[PDB]
Amino acid sequence: XXXXXXXXXXXXXXXXXXXXXXXXXXXXXXXXXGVLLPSLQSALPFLDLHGTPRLEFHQSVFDELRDKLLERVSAIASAEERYKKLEDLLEKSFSLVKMPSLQPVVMCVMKHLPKVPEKKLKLVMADKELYRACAVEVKRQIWQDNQALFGDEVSPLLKQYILEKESALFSTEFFSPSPKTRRQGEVVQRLTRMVGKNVKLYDMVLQFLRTLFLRTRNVHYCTLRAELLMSLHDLDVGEICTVDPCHKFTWCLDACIRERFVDSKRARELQGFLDGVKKGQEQVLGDLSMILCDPFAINTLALSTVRHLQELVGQETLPLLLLLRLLALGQGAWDMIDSQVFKEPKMEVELITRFLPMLMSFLVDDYTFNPESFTKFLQEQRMACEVGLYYVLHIKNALLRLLPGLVETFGDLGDIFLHLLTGNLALLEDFCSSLFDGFFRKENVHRHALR
Template identity: 30%
Template sequence: MDAGKEKIKRMMSTGKPNQAINEFSAENGLDIPAAETIYDLLHSLGHTKWSVHEAVLKATVLSAENRIQRETLPPEQHTALLSQMKHYLAIPRLQHLPLMLLEKHPRLVPDDICQDILQTPELYQKCSVVVKRELWRRDRVLFNKYMMPLIDSYAKNNELLNMSQEICSSNVKAYSTRRRTHPALTQITSAIDADLQLYMQTLGMVRARFIETNNPMYGTLRLDLVMTMHENDVAEITKTDVCHGLAWSLDACIMKQVMDDRRVLELQKYFDGVDPENAPYGEIALILSSPYSRHILAQYILSILEDIAPNAEVSTRYSDLAWPSLVLRIGLLAHDLLLQEHPKIPGFDRSVTRKFFRSLIPFILAAQRHDRKIGSYEQHLLKGSVGKMAQLDRTGAFPAKDILYSKMSDLQPSAEDVSILVSSELARQVLYVFLLKRVAEFDIAMLNIWLPAISEAFKASLGVPSSAYDSTNTDSSQQPQIALDLRQNAFECDAFMLSLVLHIKDKKGLVTAVLNSAIQGLDLAGQGIKGANTDGVIAQAIESVPLLGLFDQQARVRHCAHEQVISFLIECTSILSAEYSNNSGMTDASSAQTQVVPVHNKESAVYFAFVLTEHAAAKYAVDPEHFDKLSKLYHKLAAVSPPQAFEYRVSGSNCPNASKFLKS
């Protein structure tokens, strides 16, 4: 186009303008015998030559577009026509014509045209995905440049992250659908289509990112990629991917949240069919590193232990623990295995399978007795009543003191149990599942038994300096960096905290019981609320409720725990607001639950929530990348804070520490 402009300039400047115009018109005008007469007629009707040429060009281009779309030429004719149209790539208005032609036979893109496109970013952007796919096949760097942002977008998405951190979730099937319809994944799979070469390159990028970050979300992406290809029936890829059989059976277990005998047998056959000398253990481990994979395996191990417990002395199922423990261990060691040139299957962690799991059985038996006792009590309450099950909240059956303080003095983890827990993520994974199930059954006493060991294990597994936990720190700080080899531990610490709060929030009566236990230890008599020492209030609450102590410890070093504390406070404050308003605005079920366990002292509870909010804003860790999400939680907390709290209502004006999160 620029060359044409220069030619016209030269013609107009070196000769007579009128003569130049006539010559140019003769050379480039319509090649029709009566063209001049037609021009005169059109001119008399108010049409310029430019408008005539514009209309002819549009009609010609439209005709060319229709013909290109309609016809598929043999390769030889296609190549010849493409060669004739090549120069149109330099004309913005016409360059889409050769690009459309390229779509008809993308594998026949000539090298010279390929280079022209690659050297012209604007032209590359105008190419369809079909044409780009061929360019990517020839230029690995270009494909990486396109794919990496999408891969990272999936792995760093907050919604997908939170879903993957829910241990024992009942929403896994819906979560899988949301993951596999996420824009990042659909763009990735659309770019790959059924191209085996691009699929393998994508897997290489996912592996590289996992090695670089040790982020388990890349393991979930690996699982989703092969399962999406399975669901799209891309046979060439699924037949070639050595992990397809593993992913297929494992995904079925994840969807149903149970590992039945049939699926376990399928998985065992898959591993039996793997050649130990040439096994792709790195690739297998990447799929097993997905939180969804690890959590379902941990649940399966716990189910075996629950089956063993009633007949522990004579049970023959102890040997059944070995296989899932080994598979889970492979997933936990994924980062190490991918770093090895020839990865080998790891050995059994016998300290866990032979000692820790056996030590856990008495606790499982105690839990089973607890559930039978609660079940009998419920049946007694419901006997002769109609519709009470919908209203019953099991925390209403016991005072808060019994729920949160009760100890089983003769049943405590041994020093060896704690030592194994500190050193083994495998042991922690199974314990997390067990304790979350206990919380779901209102068995907070069991959680309290293990809280000291969990606190110690958290500290050891994160590798954070002890100074970060110092209660004398006066300011919140940026979340400490976690060493690369410990990031999976950090992920699971966050997952347990998030899941724990979700399980507690799911039981309104349990939230109220925790709140009552926190405030019943506060002695404000004589000095009044205004005279209380705020640090002392928090210290008393932590001493009264070990659960709050775990929250406080973790939130000092993990942004996720900070979020969970505020999320818990939102639930507490919502209950307080409802009580101040005679439960207005709550659902009938929620109202019934709150009535079973009322807040003992609303004023003290409001003050405690206010003080804990200020404490959190001042001393808990913040990840700058997720500041906005945390800020939204503080805003939500302020929105549900009851107006009757007056100066202890959470707001920007009342909360100097929290004000930084409450700025609009």
Template identity: 35%
Template sequence: MASALAEVGISDAAHLKSLLKETKNPVVTIYDFEKQNRINLVSLNPALPLLDLHNVTRNEFYQSVFDQMKLVFERRIDDFSKKSKEDRNDALLKILDKAFPLASDPLLQPFVMRMLSKLESIPQDKLEKIMADPVLYQNAPIDVRRHIWLSKPDLFRDEVQELVKQFVDDVEHQVSNFVVDSCPVLKNPREKRANCKILKKIVGMTSGNKDLYDNAVLAIKTAFTTTQLHAQPFVASLRSGLLMALHDSEFKDILRRDEVYKFAWCMDACIRANAIDEKQRRELTTALNGIKKSETIIDAALILFDPSCVNLILLELETELRQILKVQGFPKGSEKIDFLMRMLRIGTSAPEMAVENSTSEPNLDRSIISRLLKRV
């Protein structure tokens, strides 16, 4: 495969190798090759023998020149940022028209990618060429790939699903090696988010873009349906994890349209407090009723299927039942028991709801409260 330099008519190492295979006088061939491809400045010629006397090889010299040019070019790119949007884009596009064919060259690739990342809108033909080259695509910075993802949402969702798989593998490893008193799944949610590299990466990929956020949520839901049951709670935790990670970041404005935002935020506060007080119960009930009407109950189910949520609900159930037993009451008369059982029912129904693509809240078997809990 021809190198990026060869494709634009510049001799490269492969060309020299080809010449050496055919020549009978390699010394002359190397001399001619160097003469044709060196820096042709009249003022430089007298200095080259001096460099030879100091044992400075041509490779060292050219590398030094390249390093200096690199610094100059980086400053020039930064200077473009000071121009108006229109002038900056015009200037960068003019350079890119000549530089982009060299994007696959390892030495020049960083410059090309840096210029692309400065553009408000990258021309589609350049995005197509990046997508067509797997190595170039993988080396492209997120700022550049984000332009691709906006035009190719399927590609973005595939990447998020791969990250979800990595997340599940990481959590399963942690769970299988946890110390009894410090289960990583049940840590403070804010602490978990701060330490989760996968979640940070997904947040960085969305970068506050509503379309990418929606596609990230869709990817999490898709991954949830294809994940084995024992690992589904971990995937479910990413639904609220992503939402709350964005809430903690500078991109929280994109969450206003998310139907489960208030519910997830309130539930997160309860988990951090390790309790659900009366005010929070009313807020969660109101939010849950609103979600039910908007037919996004599966999102609420994923939030409630998070191991931290299930753990809190069960702890609250135990506490409430103990209080009822103290006064010799009955569970079926407790509004909080009804509320907690409703949330537990929704959360534990998440796998079935995801498969069936359900938009309605699952019914709660009242006999669980009137018969089973009565015997606890």
């Protein structure tokens, strides 16, 4: 029910035609209601002679004058003169908020470069009350105004966490191998819901999502940050990528790790980016959160560590690629447990050398054919290398010898379900795998589905 001048005229006509006779009054009101250059009265008896529709004519002229030149409205919206014309059109169409404003809202959305917050607050309130169709401009205004866009992003973050939990529960026959291109889902719609060339709102939303995933969230969060960074890099989001100084570089490094998982040049680039980094408060804590929250990145780093251990066992030079992998594991182990400056306490050289010698001895035994103390030390030691050791063991006589070690490590030590599923999918040994699985709700369901 659009008011304004038209609504006032309708109210006046209703007040005038409120009984009291006046048959000529109704005719005067009908004649006064015919737009300009009164040849419409000349066209009237041409249409009156066969059951006169006036509603058909009015709806037809409204529909053509809207739809045919909404393209012209967009063309004049597509700099200073066009922006001023769009502002004037928005000021004219603001009075028709209760009126149907599909075209009136599209005219303001097309020239939405000037925010105009004095009417923008009322427009945002009306859009929140009436669920307006302004998608991009409405989302940008909601992100820049208050935490309504923050609440919308928190709901999508919870939905993404629930989807990740359901995917972890729904087991299948390699930790869901998918790069940034094929994983376009559940974040491409959220990325399009972002402001686009809105560095401040997108950065605030990313910071809120990272804080929610770190302080009161699992490790499932903070991979959506890498997903949205990859989507913006592939989407040609120049401003958002250029806002983060090292964020684009570490996102490219993460994409290269996800694409291949074995590259010395990528490791050198990551080491060079970490060497000349800023302080741990800004660009260091965020980089640590991006390293820790990446589950697919963590799996790629574990595969790279296994490959580097195999290469070191082949070369027989235990004691820089292994050091780079250890530094990456220490950086991406966890940083959201305690909020503080950027620190990298890691690289146990003696324990790392003891763990690598066990894998080297297992490989040498497997090569020659075609233990418990090392497993106890791994269970009573750093589990970051334990995950890599379990992944290496999961994927003739050497395998039979390492099966008791895998059973001992299974009885020693959340993330082990994915490693066990990968080992079962990659792999006489079936009975040993079933005995290891039965020696321990997602893990039991995965064991039942495997057998």
